[PDB]
Design an enzyme around this catalytic site. Structure first.
Site, mmCIF file in Angstrom:
data_model
loop_
_atom_site.group_PDB
_atom_site.id
_atom_site.type_symbol
_atom_site.label_atom_id
_atom_site.label_comp_id
_atom_site.label_asym_id
_atom_site.label_seq_id
_atom_site.Cartn_x
_atom_site.Cartn_y
_atom_site.Cartn_z
ATOM 1 N N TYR B 133 0.847 -1.206 0.000
ATOM 2 C CA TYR B 133 0.000 0.000 0.000
ATOM 3 C C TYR B 133 0.883 1.257 0.000
ATOM 4 O O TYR B 133 0.536 2.277 -0.608
ATOM 5 C CB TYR B 133 -1.046 -0.010 1.147
ATOM 6 C CG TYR B 133 -2.124 -1.077 1.025
ATOM 7 C CD1 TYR B 133 -3.167 -0.963 0.102
ATOM 8 C CD2 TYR B 133 -2.126 -2.190 1.855
ATOM 9 C CE1 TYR B 133 -4.166 -1.941 0.000
ATOM 10 C CE2 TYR B 133 -3.109 -3.167 1.761
ATOM 11 C CZ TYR B 133 -4.125 -3.045 0.830
ATOM 12 O OH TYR B 133 -5.091 -4.037 0.756
ATOM 13 N N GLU B 134 2.039 1.173 0.653
ATOM 14 C CA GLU B 134 3.061 2.226 0.511
ATOM 15 C C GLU B 134 3.414 2.462 -0.946
ATOM 16 O O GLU B 134 3.449 3.599 -1.388
ATOM 17 C CB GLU B 134 4.314 1.938 1.347
ATOM 18 C CG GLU B 134 4.111 2.395 2.782
ATOM 19 C CD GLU B 134 5.107 1.865 3.802
ATOM 20 O OE1 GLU B 134 6.027 1.103 3.456
ATOM 21 O OE2 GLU B 134 4.933 2.224 4.983
#
Ligand SMILES: [Mg+2]
Ligand SMILES: [Mg+2]
Ligand SMILES: [Mg+2]
Ligand SMILES: [Mg+2]
Ligand SMILES: [Mg+2]
Lengths: 169, 169, 171, 170, 171, 175, 171, 171, 169, 170
Positions: B133-134
């Site tokens: 998700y980063e």
């Protein structure tokens, strides 16, 4: 092109409605309530079946192929005005139906429905469409500023109109 | 990846989403109401069919195999935020689909619903999903302590967000 | 402070709740449904009267003046957590009542309702409130970026929590 | 002085009589009505509907001054239409400006809307002036739009945006 | 003074007494196995269960009609012929010797009118004197329930104690 | 052992009600649904519609890999303050004495303690079934009460053991 | 052949059997003490009393699922622990020896599952052989009710006969 | 005649009732409420399904052909009387069925329903019908002058009766 | 006699008609529904308030004393008939009022409701009332055998009628 | 021949479509309506109301020929108003006379009414003739009574009495 009829919308047509209001990346509405799913749309159909603030007309050719959809919304029976919108099915876009469907819609609106004025919104980023509606007798009466979020940004639309008295001369 | 489609959930899809809960040792919710049986799910579905606080999309490939589910919940139209989650069926995991589906969901959230913030919750003990998700542009904004009871104990989760202004530029 | 009582909200208290909205200048919700009018609220009240996802306690003194409201919302009985908010009527602010009400709410949550975690959101632009909750045992677990549109712009809030085991073992 | 004591509060069921008297054709959530009974039925139907929002306006002695309406509220495009009505007995007192600004505060600081627009009869340039002085700009001159006094009249469409309203003095 | 105490079946008008009684023991109250806090919630449950015969309640009064307390029978099963019993005495009247009399009236109803076979109750292990009061009224321990209830901040053990019709009738 | 591992638990559905009904066929005891008694299928069906959203009881139908109906796991008197519930298991007569009971007891405990996050599970077992008492002791249950003439069963009043296990004992054994 | 007979609780689908059975005895039929003639009336009464526990009925079948008859318990009082019993055998199956077996199944349910104390019945004085069948099943005469019922054209006397739980259980 | 059965009317028979009205040329009533359409009748049927002031029996042969209708109306349970009417479908008239149906109705009235008196009205201008009822035991007790408007004019009717004691003692 | 008035029954009158049943060892009916308690009477009254099958008039003198009751029941508007009855309170009996009230009722029945026949039932063992109705122009048309159970046995009644054409000439 | 096979039966719910199609302003128990939904609601409301009575007319093959109506039925004065409508596709076939007489049979031999009256446009003297041949007589010439075809027209009121109808051939 003279082979094109408007038929009032029936329950069976909702599948078409849904297929159309599909790959369009805008929020779709039925009597101003939003829907994405077929089942949402059906439940809305049942809830507004007697309401005549919007009237929809399916467009067919000679062998009853579904060609597109004419909608009138925000119908007001005192001022006798309505907002016009058109959807051609992707497979029949670009074949020359748009003009014909538009004049049929105006004819229905101005003779059968006895409306005084028809208007519509056209994205300003689509000067082709603007010119089309121009050629069909519509005229600008508004340049609506950031009226709609469309495709990740606020956009302007032309408000274009035509009157019954002009179309019937 | 490019052939994966999103489609709004219908009644026919409830069996699919129900089976997706088997492979998850956790309680499921429909509009914040818990449920275990399909019959409970169907009643909740009918009850919340036009409720706009949540929205779900079934993911299919071009073959119409059922790949997964994209959910937006806690949609608030004042603060313009929503919580996002994704479930990919066991057979379709580690095929590199996740990134694509995340982007489709942001796309919907930011280009069409005109939301301002999208957040999610990731188990701190899944640093692999954390990193994914980063890579999609989410940033940590919280480390929620003992937030959820999962697999027999209380666990921390990251709360990660991304804003309309970053995704669109 | 000792004469401050908590009492489960009732229909008669709704007019008090409505007036607490007057100078707050934010959207008010009842079980996540938005409202402004008294008539809207009264009807949402009747609809959710058996719904256990929120619970509310009117705060009264010994003379039954209406001092404030304790709300628990987003209550979840699996994870055993809830979000907490406290509101003191403006004519009763600055009298030190907040600490007492915070503790009464924790006491109810952890000794009666048997929850595991209580959490709340505090505007980052209100560091006094933040420090107050810190003195009551809360700890920052997040700084939520542009979480809420408040009074003309998006603001950050701290998410702060306390656990049942910490509150119950305290000195 | 008098302006600063004007209050807005959300419309209640008890205010429907006042509303009825303000029309001496009317609409309620875009549904048409005439008799007091009709309105009250429509009110019960739309009580939790969030597409419109009304505030009744009162002075310190609690007299009914008028009404602010937000209608056509859309939370995707983040827009709404604004209307204000002031009772005959309280016109020409300076209230309009004060109320227009309260309605914009509500719309832009609490609803978080992007755009507020209104329609104003072209044959009422005083209103037009007033709205311009409040930051509204013409975006349309709508031809033969509304049937008013036995004939069709043009109306201005005027708008203002959230960021313009909020940063005005900066 | 104890023969001057009366039981009469609970009425709507006694709901406010019940609600104050229970409010003040800091426990979660239930009406026909459904939970409540709000009076309005109590009142609706009352209307819903008004003819339901699974629980029965009697308000206890003196001759001057002072409200003394409450006798409750719940989980009334008419196949196994058992019910759970509880007595609540208002704090001002605790210590006055009323309890034995109330316990016996409850048994008399249970065993001479409803024709039950077994009555039982739960009593906190941390209240050994009440254990003793019940023993002296004929109850015997049949269980020591481990961490059965969360009450005021911790999980408590309770004794389960019973008496049979045949034993009460042949004293 | 092979068949034990292949058993599934799934939430009870309307179509499973016939099965529940047949399970009472040779049980010679009063059956209840959310504490309301019943005897016919049609009675049960109506009680099911009535408590479908009620969280005080939860039931799971047990099947093998070929979807045979093996039995039922039942949690009743679920209280989310005290965090306790009563448990029962019913194996269809044809599937008894194949070892399934141990497996299903462990599944019920797992669900109770790792998904519902309850603190205590208890059950009642006929004092005259010392073989089941022993099975529950092997699964971690301990006697906390010997209830005297608690239930009228097959023509006389019978005693039951009340037995319990706690979440902390079940989840922390190997920690 | 008699151990091959089954009782199962009456379902909606068995209403038509009940209605034919009763139609053909030329008597006025009652469902939960309310009278009916029309099937549609039976069906509505059925829906209204579906969870009512004052009467209980079992349809009797063989192994081939032939419909044999009906076992009824009515006036079921759970304080006095009594009920009235009746058995109806379809005319084609009368005389086959099923009655004793059905009477015993009825008693077994009454006395080993419902935990009743007394079961009783009415039997026409003009049917002395049925009197004898019931005597041989353990029933004793406790009344001779004079002109109790108007049946087929005249007022008839009936014997009232009972058996107690304690007697049936210690055979 | 022996193969003619009486059976309590049901909803499915309403179409038969409606068609019996076709060539009768008078107003038809359901529990004294007038009707002409099938939809009116169906709705009156649902309203009065538990109303015991009228009762109706469809007449079927062994082959379940619809032969006719027996109606009792104005039933009174204090005075124990009712008014009787019989209707035979036109395609089944002149086959001698009327006598059998009259007796079946009397039998039901006097041996099951336990009424005291049955009475009926017969057009004075139909002396065959009159004589028929006389053979069945009825006797004139009145000649009602211009009682009913029938087919364009007021007509006289005989009121005829029979008592329970006369029918039951008959040879 | 000439000062006696008829007034349509109101809710306020139910107590009066209820007390009138005390002095009658018989069962009373309201629109053919039996009743004993006032509360039953009040419910029946509300239920049949616009039912036109029965009509009742309270009789008062000029002092507004409550003299009696005139009832028309079984009103049929096809056959144009109705059954008539009268009750005079015990204290006001044998004051010669009966004849006057009978005539007021016929007057109403024949001049305003436009009925064609009015009938009544008189106990055969009350030849005094028999004779009175004869004097008013009623004629016997039946002698109903054991019609009513009254005072512990079945009794005969005369059925007596009069027609619009005789009363009006 | 064809006339003798005409039948009347009471209007049912299934006939409301036929009724709707017969109007290509309408009333139902004197309540006004336009859409098929509106009619069906009014029908459920007045299903047992005895102030009006309708009969649909069918041939032997069950085709829908038209409608007989009795309205304004009053059982004190014993009168009613009569209307007949015949479907376009079945006009000029002689049916009217047959139906008029059935309606009078019903009204005078079963309802026991005293007077039946009708209204007929003065600009339709063929209808007028027809009704006169059936025994109807003018009792009124109603001036500018009904708005029909963008203007007010006169209508005849015509009546007939029970005893005249029934004794006609005596
Ligand atoms: Mg709109
Ligand atoms: Mg929420
Ligand atoms: Mg229980
Ligand atoms: Mg009884
Ligand atoms: Mg009658």
């Amino acid at each position: 092109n003279s082979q094109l009829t408007l038929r009032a919308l029936e329950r069976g047509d909702l599948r078409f409605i849904h297929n159309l209001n599909n790959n369009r990346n805008i929020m779709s509405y039925w009597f101003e309530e939003p829907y994405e799913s077929f089942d949402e749309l059906e439940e809305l159909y049942n809830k507004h079946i007697h309401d005549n603030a919007e009237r929809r007309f399916v467009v067919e050719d000679a062998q009853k192929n579904l060609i597109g959809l004419v909608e009138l919304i925000e119908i007001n029976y005192i001022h006798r005005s309505a907002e016009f919108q058109i959807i051609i099915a992707p497979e029949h876009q670009g074949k020359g139906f748009a003009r014909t469907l538009i004049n049929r819609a105006l004819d229905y609106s101005f003779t059968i429905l006895n409306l005084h004025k028809i208007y519509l919104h056209v994205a300003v980023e689509n000067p082709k469409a603007v010119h089309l509606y121009e050629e069909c007798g519509f005229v600008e009466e508004g340049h609506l500023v950031e009226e709609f979020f469309i495709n990740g940004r606020y956009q302007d639309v032309k408000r274009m109109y035509i009157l019954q008295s002009k179309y019937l001369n």
